[PDB]
Write a protein that binds this DNA or RNA. Structure first.
Lengths: 124, 141, 55, 185
RNA sequence: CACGGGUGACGGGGAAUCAGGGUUCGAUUCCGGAGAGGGAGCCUGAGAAACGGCUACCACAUCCAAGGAAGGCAGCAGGCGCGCAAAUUACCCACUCCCGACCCGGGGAGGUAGUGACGAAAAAUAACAAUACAGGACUCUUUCGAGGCCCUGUAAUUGGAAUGAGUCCACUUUAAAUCCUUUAACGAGGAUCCAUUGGAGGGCAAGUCUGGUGCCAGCAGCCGCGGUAAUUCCAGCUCCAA
């Protein structure tokens, strides 16, 4: 009973994708996940859900409607060319560094103490 | 104004500048002597050290004994005969204890039956005296 | 002298505070106040008695 | 430096006299009859009327055919009719001064709920808004101080998710029916 | 009104406050100036008299093997002192842009959270119905009293109806979170899931109520109360203002 319609739809040849505002109607139930959105847009636009990156969901007061925004890529390699790394980690296909920012600052000045090749020996 | 010339602005402004110094409120707020003689120095509240408790005799017809405390400051070193605000609160105050002293509300003028005191105690030993009267707080001993 | 501090407060006889129904609060406090001032009164001659006036 | 508002503004003005008998009679009439909560929002509607009254007065001082008066006069009268306070045949800047504080209080949604007759009490009307049982143009309003527009007046009804309307029963009905069935087995 | 002195004077755009005019403030996010403990001098660089650059003196402070070496948080945190007075030694470059040889690296700039009754905006702490009653517009009754076509309120009298605060999952949110919103389930009849702060002679709304106190304690911004019937002190009831 969840119907998805098209708002602010326009193609991108400068950016090799599509983009539109996703309007989701789910009255009487919870906010559907971003994963659930992907195949519903995949079937109605007849594409694969792996090139579907949809986010930015905020529920209106009273329920029944959430406003979201997403991009449709032309191909999977385009989806990894021009995209922030965190959204690639949102779907689990990218694993970023887990080293804290403070620790990255700790060995930076310690490598400054040693002039020469032995900067790499200071780190760990 | 008396003179009504079209270019007497410097005459009118100088008269208003000079006659303002004859006003009690303007001269008090624009002289260093008024702030020099104030033990607070423009401060709303201040902390002081109790060195003794002083009983102050009352004025004309209404006659009683008012309980006061000789408060010695830490920021200036001056001594203030501050008044203990409420009834039966001199048992709460002890010797050599820091007290938060403010004014009483008349802004530099002796208030009512008490002669020569403009100051009241708010907090004692970082504990509010109002809660001591209400029993909401107990003095650490 | 300074010995008679807390003279009366010490010797005043202690009454423990008795229990009563908690007052209706919020807009219900003003709802209760509105009716018994305006609509519940009747036209009577003489001095209007105060809310706390007892003789 | 941060990029934000730093705009704090009071929505009400306290009276100059606190303790007069005449003002205490007048505002207490306005609270109980329309189900208000405190004297603060009483002063809060008066402060909004003071802005409209002062904006109208400076337009009367301006001469006729003043393009500032022509544009601001028409823009101010556009908003007055569309909230259902000023008649469309009374559209003129000089009857703004004759507008009282008694007229604004119907267009509050708490009073409009009683005026439409779907609440038993004016104070019960505030409970229905608080418990999200009603909606305006398919949008639930939880606040009684909603300003109902003239064109949005006829769309006020119960919300879809409301036991008083066409929705699921509340907690008490689920509590009473479960033990009624639980007692019977 | 020169010169000089003080300035508890960084200046302005502006802030509070006003019918009209004015008064006070502007350390504080934007612009411009000055500085990195106080001076002074300089290297490089297009641009510095730079101090998250040197060179000396002054004051403070550090390690020392006693030979010597080395420092500037009015940068974000944080610690001491000073005070009446002011937060975390948190996370992240995901937004804004900036810098570099640069699509890629870096940014305590900045963003996100924590403390936080500075303050501002919205807004809980209840609502309905029935029984006794105190009664209100009507008809009869010269009064008494009646039915309630219409109601108004009171009473730990009774009854169910609806939600939040909190418990609480799914999703969303976000760099990862968090908050809000949606979503299930619970969750209130003294809905103990209990609202406090001042005052009750006048200004100034609200007891000539009760007891104790007896010019004592004390109250009181002011007028004034208290000396044995205190409408003013201390308690209780009640009431009044937000």
């Amino acid at each position: 009973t969840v119907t998805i319609r098209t708002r602010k739809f326009m193609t991108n040849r400068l950016l090799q994708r599509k983009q539109m505002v996703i309007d989701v109607l789910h009255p009487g139930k919870a906010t559907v996940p971003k994963t659930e959105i992907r195949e519903k847009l995949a079937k109605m636009y007849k594409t694969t859900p792996d090139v579907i990156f949809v986010f930015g969901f905020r529920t209106h007061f009273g329920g029944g409607k959430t406003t979201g925004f997403g991009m449709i890529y032309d191909s999977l390699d385009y989806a990894k060319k021009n995209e922030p790394k965190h959204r690639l980690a949102r779907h689990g296909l990218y694993e970023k560094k887990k080293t804290s920012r403070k620790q990255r600052k700790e060995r930076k000045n310690r490598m400054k103490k040693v002039r020469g090749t032995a900067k790499a020996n200071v780190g760990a | 104004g008396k003179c009504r010339g079209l270019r007497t602005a410097r005459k009118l402004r100088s008269h208003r500048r000079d006659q303002k110094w004859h006003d009690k409120q303007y001269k008090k707020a624009h002289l260093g002597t008024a702030l020099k003689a104030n033990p607070f120095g423009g401060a709303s509240h201040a902390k002081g050290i109790v060195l003794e408790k002083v009983g102050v005799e009352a004025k004309q017809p209404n006659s009683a004994i008012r309980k006061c405390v000789r408060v010695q400051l830490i920021k200036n070193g001056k001594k203030i005969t501050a008044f203990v605000p409420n009834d039966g609160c001199l048992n709460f105050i002890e010797e050599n204890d820091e007290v938060l002293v403010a004014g009483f509300g008349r802004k530099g003028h002796a208030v009512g039956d008490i002669p020569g005191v403009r100051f009241k105690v708010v907090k004692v030993a970082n504990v509010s005296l109002l809660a001591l009267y209400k029993g909401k707080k107990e003095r650490p001993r | 002298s300074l010995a008679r501090v807390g003279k009366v407060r010490g010797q005043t006889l202690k009454v423990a505070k008795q229990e009563k129904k908690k007052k209706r609060t919020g807009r219900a406090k003003r709802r209760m106040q509105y009716n018994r001032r305006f609509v519940n009164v009747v036209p009577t001659f003489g001095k209007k008695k105060g809310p706390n006036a007892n003789s | 430096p941060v990029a934000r508002s730093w705009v704090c503004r009071k929505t009400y003005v306290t009276p100059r006299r606190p303790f007069e008998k005449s003002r205490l009679d007048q505002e207490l009439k306005l609270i109980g009859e329309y189900g208000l909560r405190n004297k603060r929002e009483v002063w809060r509607v008066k402060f909004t009327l003071a802005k409209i009254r002062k904006a109208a007065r400076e337009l009367l001082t301006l001469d006729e055919k003043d393009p500032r008066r022509l544009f601001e006069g028409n823009a101010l009268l556009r908003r007055l009719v569309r909230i259902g306070v000023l008649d469309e045949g009374k559209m003129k800047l000089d009857y703004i001064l004759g507008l009282k504080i008694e007229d604004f209080l119907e267009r509050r949604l708490q009073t409009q709920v009683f005026k439409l007759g779907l609440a038993k009490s004016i104070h019960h009307a505030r409970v229905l808004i608080r418990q999200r049982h009603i909606r305006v143009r398919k949008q639930v309003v939880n606040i009684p101080s909603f300003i109902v527009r003239l064109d949005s007046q006829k769309h006020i009804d119960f919300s879809l998710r409301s036991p008083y309307g066409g929705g699921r029963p509340g907690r008490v009905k689920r509590k009473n029916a479960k033990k009624g069935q639980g007692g019977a087995g």
